[PDB]
Ligand binder design. Structure first.
Ligand SMILES: NC(=O)c1ccc[n+]([C@@H]2O[C@H](COP(=O)([O-])OP(=O)(O)OC[C@H]3O[C@@H](n4cnc5c(N)ncnc54)[C@H](O)[C@@H]3O)[C@@H](O)[C@H]2O)c1
Ligand SMILES: *c1nc2c(ncn2[C@@H]2O[C@H](COP(=O)(O)O)[C@@H](O)[C@H]2O)c(=O)[nH]1
Ligand SMILES: *c1nc2c(ncn2[C@@H]2O[C@H](COP(=O)(O)O)[C@@H](O)[C@H]2O)c(=O)[nH]1
Ligand SMILES: *c1nc2c(ncn2[C@@H]2O[C@H](COP(=O)(O)O)[C@@H](O)[C@H]2O)c(=O)[nH]1
Ligand SMILES: *c1nc2c(ncn2[C@@H]2O[C@H](COP(=O)(O)O)[C@@H](O)[C@H]2O)c(=O)[nH]1
Ligand SMILES: [K+]
Ligand SMILES: [K+]
Lengths: 362, 362, 73, 73
C-alpha cells in the first residue's frame, strides 16, 4: 500500500513548502547591496523600479496609498468595495497628482490599478474604469480556475486589450496558471488562503503552501513570459526575497502596509498605543452569510516611504548574499529546506530584546 | 515533477539540520572523562588546550576577556568597532600581561587575535595590528564568498602570511569553503545566521542550518588540513560536542561569554536580578540603515573560569560517552536524527525544577 | 484505509471524531467518507441535553466522553 | 450639631455618607438623625444601574461619585 494510506499514489499529490520551511543559500557574489537592481516586470509591458504592489483591500489601498506606492516605485490597486463612480473618481485623483523612482506612463503620469469582479455589473465597472484612464485591471477572484473568471479575462483581453493589462485572479496550481495563460492574461496572481486575515484554509480546508504554489505557477507561466505575482502571507523582507527567488516577479503586500498612515481609516488608541483596522474583503463587515475572513487591528507604523525603504534594503541584502545583479538572477537562486528547530534558530533566541530594530519586531 | 514543486530537482538543494535535530550515539569506550585530551587545532599552526574562542563583538571581547580566555586555555579575538590605535593598544595590553593550560607563544607571551574588515582602511588596520604584535588576523565579514573578502585574504597572506595566521570570514556552503581554502586561508569560519542576536535569516532570508553547514565545509577543508571554526548558535556544552563531532575543530562563543564579569560593560539590576548588555555587531547602535542584529541583555553569570570549566566538563563527558581519546577521535562520532518529540524528551520534562544546576538553565 | 476496503462493496464509511471545523468535514468527505459524525461541535448547541453553566459571565455546557469515569458509572 | 439646630423646630435630619454597617445606621439614628441615606451599601445590588463586572471569578459593579471626572463630563 501507499505509505500514507490507501492504494492511490496520487491522492496526496505533493508535500507543500511555505516561506518558513526554506532558506536562501548564499552563492559567489560580486554585488554590493547598494548597487543591486531591484527592477522587475509587473506585467508583460509594465516594469516597476520596486517590485511591490499594494493589496486591493478597503483598508489598505485608496487614492493616497496608490499615489504613495506609485511615487515609491511600485503600484497601488484600488479596491472594488466602492460604487463605480467613486472608484473612477479615485482613479482620476491618482492620475491627476523627491521621488526619482516614481512609476510613470508615456504621458508622464503616475500609474494606477483597479480591481473588478466577474459579471455584467463588473463589466460595466471595468468599462467605466478603463474610460477613466486606468492602466491595469485585476480580475480579483478567490478561485480563478472557475470558467466564469476565465471567460471574463478573455472578454477583457478581447475588448480593452490594446489599452490596459489584464491580470488574472488567484491560483495555486500549475493547471490553473496554464488555463489563465491560455485565456490571455498578462500576469498571474498566486495564493489561496495564505493571507494573514484569511480563514479559507480553515472554513473550507482548501489551499496550498505559498512557495510550492509559486514554483508550480512559474513552471506553468515562464515559457510564455507571463509574470507571477505572489499575493498573501508575506510578513518580513526575507519573505519577499524568498518569494522572488522561488520564481515570482512581483509581490503584493497586505498587513505590512495596512498600519501605515497612507492606508485609509482612523487611528485607534488602545492602552496608550496606536493601531488601525485591518480586515479581509471576505470578512462579514466588508461583505455587508459564510465569511472567509476576519476583522482585526494592526499596530501603527508611519509613513509608507520608510517601510518600503526597509523592505527594499532587506531585498538588496538578499541579492548581495545570493550574488544577484538583477531580479532575473535572483530567480535562479537555490533553497535549503529546514526543520522547526532550524526555524527557531533563524529568529533571535535566548535574548531579551530591550530596543526595537527598524526592520524587525517579535 | 518534484514533490516540493516545479521541474527542477535542484531548486531545494538539501535538507539542513541544526544542533537541536541530532544526538551523539554512544559507542564502545575505554576513556575516562577526566583523562580525555581536549586539545585541538585553531589554525594550521596554533593549537589550543581548550578548543574555545571568544567572539569579536563590542560587548564580548576586550583586553580583559582576551587575557582571561588565553589563561583559561582558549583565545580571544578583539572586536574592530574601535579606533585602530585603540585596538593596537588593546593588543599590546594583552601581550604585556594556576593557569597550567594557558596558551602562549614561543616567547611565553599570551596569544591573542584581532578582527579586520575589507578595504584599504582595513589594510591599514591590519598592518598596524601586525606591527603591534597580533598572533592571528580574522577577516571578519558576513558573506565570505564575496570577491573582495577573498582578495583581502589573499593580500594578507601574501604580505604577512609568514608572521600571522589569516582566518577567513563566515561561510555556509562547500563551494565558499573551497574558495576560501584556495585563496590561502589558514582557517575557515562557518555560520551565517545562527547567532542568538542575528536577524539575517529574517531580514534577508539567507542562511543554512549549522550542522549541515559544518559538514559541508569540512567536506572541503579536511582534505587540505584546514581547520573549521563553528561560530554562532551554541547554547549548551552538548552543542559544542555536536559541532566538534560534525567536523569542526573549535567553537567561537557569543552569548555564552557575554554575561560573565570579564566581558566589557556594566552590571544592570532589574527586579533584584543581574543582567548585562549584549548586542549584535550589525545592530543599529553597533553600526552607528538596514541592521541585521538586535540589542538586548543576558543574565549575569560570573567569572569566566567557572563557565569554561563547566563547558569543558560537558565536552569531556561527551568524549567519554563516545569513546574518543582525542578531539580527532571525536570528529568521527555518528549522529542520530530526532524529531520534535525527541527534543522534548532530551530536555527535562514533567518536572518543576526548584534549584538551578551549574550547567543547565530552564 | 477503510475506504480502500469498503468502496468495492458499496458500503459507506462514516468519519467519527476529531472534527472541529467545516474544512475538516470537507477533508473527511474528500478522503472517501460519505458522512461525518459530530461531537463537541453540537455539544454546545441549545438542543443538546444539559443545563447551562455560567462561568465569569459566559455560557458553557457540559461535555464528557462515554468512557469517562462519570459516564461509565 | 445639626440636631441641636433642628430639633426645636421639628425639622428632621438625614445622615448622608460614611455608613458601612448597620451599627453605623444605629449610631446615626441615636445621635439624633431620623433617616439615613445609603451609597456604597446599595451600589452593589441587582436593582442598582450598571452592568456586572467579572474579575478573577468574582462579581462587582461600578461605583463613582457625582463630583468625579467621569460623572461631571
Ligand atoms: N556571520 C553573519 O551571518 C553576520 C551577519 C551580519 C553581521 N555580521 C557581523 O557584523 C559585522 C559586519 O558585517 P559585514 O560583513 O556586513 O561587515 P562590512 O560591512 O564591513 O562588510 C565587509 C565585507 O563583507 C562582504 N559582505 C557583507 N555583507 C554582504 C552582503 N550582504 N552581500 C555581499 N557581500 C557582503 C563584502 O565583501 C564587504 O566588503 C561583522 O562583525 C560580522 O561578523 C555577521
Ligand atoms: C482571505 N484572503 C483575503 C481576504 N481579503 C483579501 N485577501 C488576500 O490577502 C492578501 C493580503 O494578505 P496579507 O498576508 O495580509 O498580505 C490580499 O492581497 C488578498 O489576495 C479574505 O477575506 N480572505
Ligand atoms: C548576525 N550575526 C552576528 C552579528 N554580529 C555578530 N554575529 C555573529 O554571531 C556570533 C554570535 O553567536 P551567538 O549565538 O551569539 O553565540 C558572532 O560570533 C558573529 O559571528 C549581527 O549583527 N548579526
Ligand atoms: C474516546 N472517544 C469517545 C468517548 N466517548 C465517545 N467517543 C467518541 O468520540 C466521538 C466524538 O468526538 P468529537 O471529537 O468530540 O467530535 C464520538 O462520536 C465517539 O465515537 C470516550 O470516552 N473516549
Ligand atoms: C463626595 N461626596 C459625594 C459625591 N457624590 C456623592 N456624594 C455624597 O456621598 C454619599 C455617598 O456616601 P457613601 O459613603 O458612599 O454611602 C452620597 O449620597 C452623596 O451625599 C462626590 O463626588 N464626592
Ligand atoms: K538567529
Ligand atoms: K531528559
Amino acid at each position: 500500500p501507499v505509505p500514507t494510506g490507501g492504494d492511490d499514489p496520487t491522492k496526496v499529490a505533493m508535500l507543500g513548502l511555505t516561506f518558513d520551511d526554506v532558506l536562501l543559500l548564499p552563492a559567489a557574489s560580486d554585488v554590493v547591496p547598494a548597487t543591486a537592481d531591484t527592477s522587475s516586470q509587473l506585467t508583460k509591458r509594465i516594469r516597476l523600479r520596486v517590485p511591490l504592489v499594494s493589496s486591493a483591500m478597503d483598508t489598505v489601498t485608496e487614492s493616497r496609498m496608490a499615489i504613495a506606492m506609485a511615487r515609491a516605485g511600485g503600484m497601488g490597486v484600488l479596491h472594488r468595495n466602492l460604487p463605480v463612480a467613486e472608484q473612477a473618481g479615485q482613479v482620476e485623483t491618482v492620475k491627476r497628482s523627491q521621488f526619482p523612482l516614481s512609476t510613470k506612463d508615456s504621458d508622464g503620469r503616475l500609474l494606477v490599478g483597479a480591481a473588478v469582479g466577474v459579471g455584467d455589473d463588473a463589466w460595466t465597472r471595468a468599462m467605466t474604469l478603463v474610460d477613466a484612464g486606468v492602466d491595469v485591471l485585476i480580475v480579483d477572484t478567490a478561485h480563478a480556475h472557475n470558467r466564469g473568471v476565465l471567460d471574463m479575462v478573455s472578454r477583457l483581453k478581447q475588448a480593452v486589450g490594446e489599452r490596459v493589462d489584464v491580470v488574472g485572479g488567484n491560483v495555486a496550481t500549475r493547471a490553473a496558471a496554464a488555463a489563465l495563460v491560455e485565456a490571455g492574461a498578462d500576469a498571474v496572481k498566486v495564493g489561496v488562503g495564505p493571507g494573514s486575515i484569511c480563514t479559507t484554509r480553515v472554513v473550507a480546508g482548501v489551499g496550498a503552501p505559498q512557495i510550492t504554489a509559486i514554483l508550480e505557477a512559474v513552471a506553468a507561466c515562464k515559457p510564455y513570459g507571463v509574470p507571477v505575482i505572489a499575493d498573501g502571507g508575506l510578513q518580513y523582507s526575507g519573505d519577499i526575497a524568498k518569494a522572488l527567488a522561488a520564481g515570482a516577479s512581483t509581490a503584493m503586500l497586505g498587513s505590512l502596509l495596512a498600519g501605515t498612515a497612507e492606508s485609509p481609516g482612523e487611528l485607534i488608541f488602545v492602552n496608550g498605543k496606536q493601531f488601525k483596522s485591518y480586515r479581509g474583503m471576505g470578512s462579514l463587515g466588508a461583505m455587508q452569510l459564510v465569511p472567509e475572513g476576519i476583522e482585526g487591528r494592526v499596530p501603527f507604523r508611519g509613513p509608507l516611504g520608510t517601510v518600503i525603504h526597509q523592505l527594499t534594503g532587506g531585498l538588496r541584502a538578499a541579492m548581495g548574499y545570493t550574488g544577484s545583479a538583477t531580479i532575473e538572477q535572483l530567480q535562479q537562486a537555490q533553497f535549503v529546506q529546514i526543520t522547526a528547530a532550524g526555524l527557531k534558530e533563524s529568529h533571535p533566541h535566548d535574548i531579551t530584546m530591550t530596543v526595537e530594530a527598524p526592520n524587525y519586531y517579535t
